[PDB]
Amino acid sequence: DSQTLVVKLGTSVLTGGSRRLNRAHIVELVRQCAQLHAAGHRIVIVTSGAIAAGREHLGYPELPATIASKQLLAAVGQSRLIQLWEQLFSIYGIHVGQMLLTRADMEDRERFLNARDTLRALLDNNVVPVINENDAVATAEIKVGDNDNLSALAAILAGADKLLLLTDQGGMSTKLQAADVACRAGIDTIIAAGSKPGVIGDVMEGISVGTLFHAQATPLENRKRWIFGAPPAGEITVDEGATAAILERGSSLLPKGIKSVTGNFSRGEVIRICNLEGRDIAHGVSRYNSDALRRIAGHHSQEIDAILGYEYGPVAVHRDDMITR
Amino acid sequence: DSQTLVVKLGTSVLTGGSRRLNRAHIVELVRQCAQLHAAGHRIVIVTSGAIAAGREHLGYPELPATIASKQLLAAVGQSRLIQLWEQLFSIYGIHVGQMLLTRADMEDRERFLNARDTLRALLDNNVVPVINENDAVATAEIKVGDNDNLSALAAILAGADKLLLLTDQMSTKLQAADVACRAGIDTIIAAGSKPGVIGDVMEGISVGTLFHAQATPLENRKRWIFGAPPAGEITVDEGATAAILERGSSLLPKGIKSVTGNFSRGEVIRICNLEGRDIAHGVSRYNSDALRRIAGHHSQEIDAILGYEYGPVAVHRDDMITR
Ligand SMILES: N[C@@H](CCC(=O)OP(=O)(O)O)C(=O)O
Ligand SMILES: N[C@@H](CCC(=O)OP(=O)(O)O)C(=O)O
Ligand SMILES: O=C1CC[C@@H](C(=O)O)N1
Ligand SMILES: O=C1CC[C@@H](C(=O)O)N1
Ligand SMILES: [Mg+2]
Numbered sequence: 001d002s003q004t005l006v007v008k009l010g011t012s013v014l015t016g017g018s019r020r021l022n023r024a025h026i027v028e029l030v031r032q033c034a035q036l037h038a039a040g041h042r043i044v045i046v047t048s049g050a051i052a053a054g055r056e057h058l059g060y061p062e063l064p065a066t067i068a069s070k071q072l073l074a075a076v077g078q079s080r081l082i083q084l085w086e087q088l089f090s091i092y093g094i095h096v097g098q099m100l101l102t103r104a105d106m107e108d109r110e111r112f113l114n115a116r117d118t119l120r121a122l123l124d125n126n127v128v129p130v131i132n133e134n135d136a137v138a139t140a141e142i143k144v145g146d147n148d149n150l151s152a153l154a155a156i157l158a159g160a161d162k163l164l165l166l167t168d169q170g171g172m173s174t175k176l177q178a179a180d181v182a183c184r185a186g187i188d189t190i191i192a193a194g195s196k197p198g199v200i201g202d203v204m205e206g207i208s209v210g211t212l213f214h215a216q217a218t219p220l221e222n223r224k225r226w227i228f229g230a231p232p233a234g235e236i237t238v239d240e241g242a243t244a245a246i247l248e249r250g251s252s253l254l255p256k257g258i259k260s261v262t263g264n265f266s267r268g269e270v271i272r273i274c275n276l277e278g279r280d281i282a283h284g285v286s287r288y289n290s291d292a293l294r295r296i297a298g299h300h301s302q303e304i305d306a307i308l309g310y311e312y313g314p315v316a317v318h319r320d321d322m323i324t325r
Numbered sequence: 326d327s328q329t330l331v332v333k334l335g336t337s338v339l340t341g342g343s344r345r346l347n348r349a350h351i352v353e354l355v356r357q358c359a360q361l362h363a364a365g366h367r368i369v370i371v372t373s374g375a376i377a378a379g380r381e382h383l384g385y386p387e388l389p390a391t392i393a394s395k396q397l398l399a400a401v402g403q404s405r406l407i408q409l410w411e412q413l414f415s416i417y418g419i420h421v422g423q424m425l426l427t428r429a430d431m432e433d434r435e436r437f438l439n440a441r442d443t444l445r446a447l448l449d450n451n452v453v454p455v456i457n458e459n460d461a462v463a464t465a466e467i468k469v470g471d472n473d474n475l476s477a478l479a480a481i482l483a484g485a486d487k488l489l490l491l492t493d494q495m496s497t498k499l500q501a502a503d504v505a506c507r508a509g510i511d512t513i514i515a516a517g518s519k520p521g522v523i524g525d526v527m528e529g530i531s532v533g534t535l536f537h538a539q540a541t542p543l544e545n546r547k548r549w550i551f552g553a554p555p556a557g558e559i560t561v562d563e564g565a566t567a568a569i570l571e572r573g574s575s576l577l578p579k580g581i582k583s584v585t586g587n588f589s590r591g592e593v594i595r596i597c598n599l600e601g602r603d604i605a606h607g608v609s610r611y612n613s614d615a616l617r618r619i620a621g622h623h624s625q626e627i628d629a630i631l632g633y634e635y636g637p638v639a640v641h642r643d644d645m646i647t648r
Contacts, residue, residue, distance in 0.1 A: 058420065061450070067439075068446035075422030075443065076452060079407045086404055095383060097400030101462045104429055114396075114464045121393035122400060125386065129400065134459070137426045139439045264589040266612065289612045290589065295632060309618055 004042040004123065004160045005204055007033065008151035008178075011048040012168035013194040020056050021049055021081075025194070027088050029166075032200040033128070034092035041204065042123040044158045045096075046131045046151040047085065053077035067140065074135030085130045095127045100134035104142040106153065106229025107270065113226075116157045123158065142231055148178040153229050156185045163187050164203050166194035179213040181228055186219030188212070220323070227323045232272035232283055234263025234290055236316070243275040246282055246324060253284070253317040255304070258297035265290045267312060284322030287312050329367040329448070329485045330527060332358065333476035333501075336373040337493035338517040345381050346374055350517070352413050354491075357523035358453070359417035366527065367448045369483050370410065370421075370455045371476035375402035378409070392465070399460030410455045420452045425459035429467045431478065431552025432593065438549075441482050448483070467554055473497040477504035477512075481548050485510050489526050491517035492533075502536040503648075504551050509542025511535065543646065550606055550646045553593035557586030557613055559639070566598040569605055569647060576607070576640040578627070581620035588613045590635065596645075607645030610635045 009029065016022040033043045051070060054077025063069040082098045089096050099118065106112045122129045131154050133144055144150040148165060155163040163182045165175050179189040190203050192210025202209040238246075242257025253273065265271055266289050273282040288296070293316060296304050301314035334354065341347040358368045376395060379402025380386075388394040407423045414421050424444065431437045447454045456479050458468055469475040473490060474497060480488040481504075488505045490498050494516045502512035513526050515533025525532045561569075565580025576596065588594060589612050596605040611619070611631075616639060619630050624637030 058450075058452075063450075066442075066446075068442040071439075071443040072422060072446040072450060072452065075424055075447060075454070076420060079411050079421060079423045079455075082404045083408050083411070086408065095401055096404060097397060097461065098404045099400055099461050100425055100459065105462050108464075111464050111467075115462055117393040118396035118400060118461055121397040125383075125388070125397060127383075127397065127401060130404075134425065134462075136422065136424050136443060137430050137440060137459075139436050141435070264591055264612070266587040266589045267614075268587050289587070289614050291612050291615060291631075291633070308614075310614065 002040045002042070003162065003204060004044070004158055005036065005162045005164060006044040006046060006151055006155040006158060006160045007164045007166065007200060008046040008147060009048065009166050009194065010147055010168075011052055013166045014047070014049040015052055017168055019052065021053055021084065023084065023088070026084070027091070029194065029200065030088045030092065032198070034089070034094055035201060036204055037092070037094055037126075037128065042158075043128050044119070044123070044131065044154060044160065045085065045128055046147060046154050047081060048132070048147050050074040050077035050081050050132060050135050053080040053084070071136050078132065078136060081132070082130060089128060096130045097122045097127045099129050099131045101131070102134050102138045102142045103144055103229060103231035106226060107231060109226050112157070112229055119154075119157050120159070146174045148174040149181065152178040152181040152185075155182050155187045156225050156228060160187050162203060163189045164200065165189065165191045166199070167191060169193045183213050183215050184220045185225050185228070186215045188215045224321065224323060227270060227283055227285070227321070230270035230283065233265035233269040234261065235272040235274055236261050236293065237274045237276065238281070240276060243281060246273070246322075250319055250324070252315045252319045252322070254301060254314070255293065255296040255316045256298065256300055258293060258316060261290055261293045261297060263290060271317070273317070282322055282324045284317035287316060287318065327365040327367070328487065328527065329369070329483055330361065331369045331371060331476055331480040331483055331485045331488045332523060333371040333472060333488070333490045334373065334517065335472055335491070335493075336377055338491045339372070339374045340377055341518075342493055344377065346378055346409065348409070348413075351409070352416065354517065354523060355413045355417065357521065359414065359419055360524060361527055362417070362419055362451070362453065367483075368453050369444070369448070369479060369485065370453055371472055371479050372406060372410065372455055372457055373472045375399040375406050375457060375460055378402035378405040396461055403457065403461060406457070407455060414453060421455045422447045422452045424454050424456045426456070427459050427463045427467045428469055428552060428554035431549060432554060432556070434549055437482075437552055444479075444482050445484070454483075471497045473501040474504065477501040478552050480505050480510045481508045481551065487526060488512045489523065490514045491522070493517065506536050507539050507543045508548050508551070509538045511538045547644065547646060550593060550608070550644070553606065555595035555606055556592040557584070557588040558595040558597055559584055559616065560597045560599065561604070563599065566604060569596070573642055573647070575638045575642040576645070577624060577637065578616065578619040578622055578639045581616060581639060584613050584616045584620065586613060594640070596640065605645050605647040607640035610639055610641065
């Protein structure tokens with residue numbers, strides 16, 4: 001009976017479409033979560049609003065149009081944001097815990113497992129995790145970049161049964177991607193209006209509300225779900241045949257099919273695979289250092305030993321360490 | 326004339342040696358900072374106490390002695406902690422900004438500079454950065470591992486003139502003073518319970534122990550290397566150890582004896598002597614497999630061995646910090 005639900009609240013949900021966090025709207029969504037919590041369910045919050053909270057608290061100041069500006073606002077806003085969640089949940093006797101992360105914290109199976117553990121330890125002790133991107137401390141390069149996608153990753157981390165993406169009803173687009181990442185990991189996804197009375201309870205019960213996305217009948221293997229989180233450390237461009245081999249046959253990537261290789265990356269790191277078109281067709285763990293791949297690109301499997309002076313098997317990226325599409 | 330001070334407050338300072346954060350002791354220290362802030366000075370806080378705040382807030386629950394327990398405590402505790410710093414600084418009309426980080430945020434020049442700019446943007450706008458390790462989201466492998474060392478890095482990031490390590494009155498404190506002192510930052514170790522200690526340190530009044538900034542500091546372009554977590558290691562000749570330590574020379578592949586791990590060109594690595602001691606960290610010019618392949622060989626052979634070449638040196642003196 002007990003279930004794990006991730007609720008994602010983006011900025012216009014939190015502000016009610018104004019330039020200020022709306023505590024009336026938020027406390028009403030907290031009340032709904034509390035009700036499910038009191039009933040034995042596990043609740044995870046993914047929250048936006050750090051920058052809006054900061055802008056408000058500093059009195060809307062003139063700032064250089066720079067990333068430093070946004071990060072300074074998030075440093076201030078995130079302080080205020082977590083307070084707001086803490087105070088509001090405390091009305092209902094519920095404790096919260098702050099987690100701030102980026103793709104960097106999922107560049108490994110190990111760092112992914114670490115984040116998973118923290119989050120499950122929170123839920124196991126009846127604390128609600130309040131998750132957001134670590135905006136104050138991050139380069140654009142390591143960020144998830146939108147909270148829709150982040151909440152899917154959080155759903156995976158939490159071993160969630162459902163993901164609820166609240167809307168204030170491009171914005172639709174990240175939501176569809178999130179629904180896709182989540183469903184493939186075996187998690188039901190619902191897009192629904194934050195302003196709909198009893199929305200969160202309805203979703204939890206199974207009452208048709210918002211837009212339903214069924215979890216994949218047979219989900220992507222648990223052991224490789226962490227690859228969804230990793231930021232690709234470089235990109236590999238690949239054959240017409242290799243492309244087909246990966247998308248149709250679900251096969252591994254042979255260096256025979258590699259056309260080019262961009263970036264510096266090591267064996268063990270996750271990289272992006274592109275077709276000649278330029279489209280991202282897969283992410284997967286590299287078996288070879290990047291200087292070694294440029295070297296064995298185009299050559300058959302039996303040749304690797306002799307080109308490099310060593311081998312780490314015949315495959316550039318193994319299907320078991322790969323996520324297509 | 327206006328200055329930049331980093332104040333580090335560990336757990337026993339914030340609790341006054343009990344298991345609860347002491348709001349009385351803390352507001353007094355905040356008052357001292359605020360007085361310096363109002364006079365034009367730039368104040369940065371490096372705070373411990375997330376775990377202690379967490380246990381108290383949860384009512385001292387019985388938790389498994391695991392790292393996930395510590396991480397849950399930090400997740401709850403950091404939240405309480407940032408709230409306490411904000412509430413108290415606001416007494417004085419001062420805003421705070423939360424920054425949580427690990428060595429990962431300093432594994433790179435770019436990520437290092439990104440944090441630098443954020444911390445300095447906070448200060449230019451009179452906001453006090455409240456800095457801590459990201460204990461809720463981090464593996465052991467990527468943490469600084471102690472807030473003494475963390476504050477030395479924070480001082481570097483901030484372009485601090487002084488670092489003040491507050492005590493409940495040691496080795497991690499001496500380590501942090503070394504890092505700061507080398508980066509040209511005066512480090513003071515002194516008792517947090519000393520009346521006017523923060524204000525006194527700013528005025529240069531003798532309180533506790535002062536460690537002087539290095540007469541000629543480590544070059545600024547390479548200070549970020551104190552921050553990085555080594556991505557792998559190299560073990561090195563008796564000859565190469567001596568060239569590095571005694572004559573500050575670059576590292577040539579000839580003296581490389583072994584290579585540990587998987588890493589790329591551009592990543593910081595650790596250099597070990599044969600006895601196993603850490604003697605320098607420096608940016609690798611070659612990937613780890615390439616290094617295994619050219620270890621013990623002359624620079625002339627690199628191109629012929631690898632099929633390419635990035636200069637005669639495995640780790641340049643310019644991208645290296647010894648010790
Ligand atoms: N951290 C994100 C913003 C958060 C976010 O995207 O929230 P949403 O777009 O789901 O309202 C960024 O890249 O600035
Ligand atoms: N929070 C950090 C460091 C805390 C710390 O050691 O500071 P201390 O209380 O020793 O001055 C951690 O990773 O344990
Ligand atoms: O749109 C926004 C407001 C705050 C920031 C965040 O991710 O918290 N993004
Ligand atoms: O000793 C402690 C208290 C909490 C944690 C921290 O430094 O935040 N370490
Ligand atoms: Mg201390």
